Every structure is written in structure tokens, then in C-alpha cells.
Write an enzyme that holds these catalytic residues in place. Structure first.
Site, PDB file in Angstrom:
ATOM      1  CD  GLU A 152      35.818  51.707  40.106  1.00 19.23           C
ATOM      2  OE1 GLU A 152      34.668  51.263  40.393  1.00 19.23           O
ATOM      3  OE2 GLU A 152      36.834  51.463  40.798  1.00 19.23           O
ATOM      4  CD  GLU A 179      39.049  45.136  40.769  1.00 19.67           C
ATOM      5  OE1 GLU A 179      38.738  45.714  39.683  1.00 19.67           O
ATOM      6  OE2 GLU A 179      38.441  45.300  41.846  1.00 19.67           O
TER       7      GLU A 179
END
Length: 181
Positions: free
Chosen positions: A78, A168
Site C-alpha cells: 500500500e 483519508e
């Protein structure tokens, strides 16, 4: 769609008032909570593409990033290219990999391992790669290849999964309006 955008990132977008327009390459969100979410627009298959964005990003007091966000399948990873952020620098408690120069700024580069954590394959072990912009900004172009090239000297693969320009947050409050191409 702008830049061939074909993908909507929506992890827990319901806590972030996440609204989007694929055809215009735009989205908005607004949050106030302690649940993690990652939302935005991009491509279902990542590449070393140039990602242009223009944002209003208000995340003072928040654990939050404005970032290019995506995954690689093998070795599973990620990754984030953090353009602006709130209270929490993600390289603070990670393993340092030096710095790189891209798109007008130095980036702090770091990495960490997530063992048996929620992932794109359910629950798995993967590596995170972070580039954190030293001079924060809310508009410009991210030359993703520069980041990929550098991370690849430290184990980063090239089997790209999705890739988006994302917001985010996981604590506190904020708002954002983002245009992507």
C-alpha cells in the site's frame, strides 16, 4: 473522463459525506469522527502516470492526508504520496528511506510492515511506502514515476492495483474539494 479517470475510491465514504462526479473529475468530502475512511477518484489500474490535482483541503487538528493512494499486488504493498496532511506525519514512527526530489519539493521517504492487517485481499501482510511532501501544497502535478522509481530500489513492485487521488482521515474534522486529472 479527465485523464482517463475510471474508478471511484470509496472506503467508509459514508462517514465523510463523500460526493463525486467522474465526468468532471471532481469530489467533495467533510468529516468529524474517529473512523478511518479513504475516498477519491482515479484509475482501476495504476501506472507511472502524472496525476494533476487542484484542491481545497482543510484538515487542521485532524489525522488526515491529501495523497495519491494505491496498491501493488505482488509483493503486496500500500503506498501514499502525501501532498498535505493534518496533525500526523506518517513517517514519524516508520523506517526512514532517505529523501527524494519531485515536482518542486523534497519528500521524506519511509516504509513500514503491516502484519495480518485489513487489506485489499481481506487480511494479509503487506509493506507500506510513503513519500511525504516537505513543502505542503493543495495543487500541482505528482510525477508518480519518480516515487515508484525510488521505492523500487527498496523492494517496491510493479503489479499495480487501483490508484487514486485521495483524502483519508481517521480522527478530528475537516473538509475537502478536489479536482483530478
Amino acid at each position: 473522463n479527465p485523464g482517463g479517470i475510471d474508478y471511484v475510491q470509496n472506503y467508509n465514504g459514508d462517514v465523510a459525506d463523500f460526493q463525486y462526479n467522474e465526468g468532471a473529475g471532481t469530489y467533495t468530502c467533510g468529516w468529524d469522527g474517529s473512523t478511518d475512511f479513504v475516498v477519491g477518484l482515479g484509475w482501476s489500474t495504476g501506472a507511472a502516470r502524472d496525476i494533476t490535482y487542484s484542491a481545497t483541503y482543510n484538515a487542521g487538528g485532524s489525522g488526515s492526508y491529501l495523497a495519491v493512494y494505491g496498491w501493488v499486488n505482488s509483493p503486496q504493498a500500500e503506498y501514499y504520496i502525501v501532498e498535505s496532511y493534518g496533525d500526523y506525519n506518517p513517517c514519524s514512527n516508520a523506517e526512514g528511506l532517505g529523501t527524494l526530489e519531485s515536482d518542486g519539493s523534497t519528500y521524506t521517504v519511509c516504509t513500514d510492515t503491516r502484519t495480518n492487517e485489513p487489506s485489499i485481499t481481506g487480511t494479509s501482510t503487506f509493506t507500506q511506502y510513503w513519500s511525504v511532501r516537505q513543502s505542503e501544497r493543495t495543487s500541482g502535478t505528482v510525477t508518480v514515476g519518480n516515487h515508484f522509481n525510488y521505492w523500487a530500489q527498496h523492494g517496491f513492485g510493479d503489479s499495480y492495483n487501483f490508484q487514486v487521488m485521495a483524502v483519508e482521515a481517521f480522527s478530528g474534522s475537516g473538509s475537502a474539494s478536489v479536482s483530478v486529472s
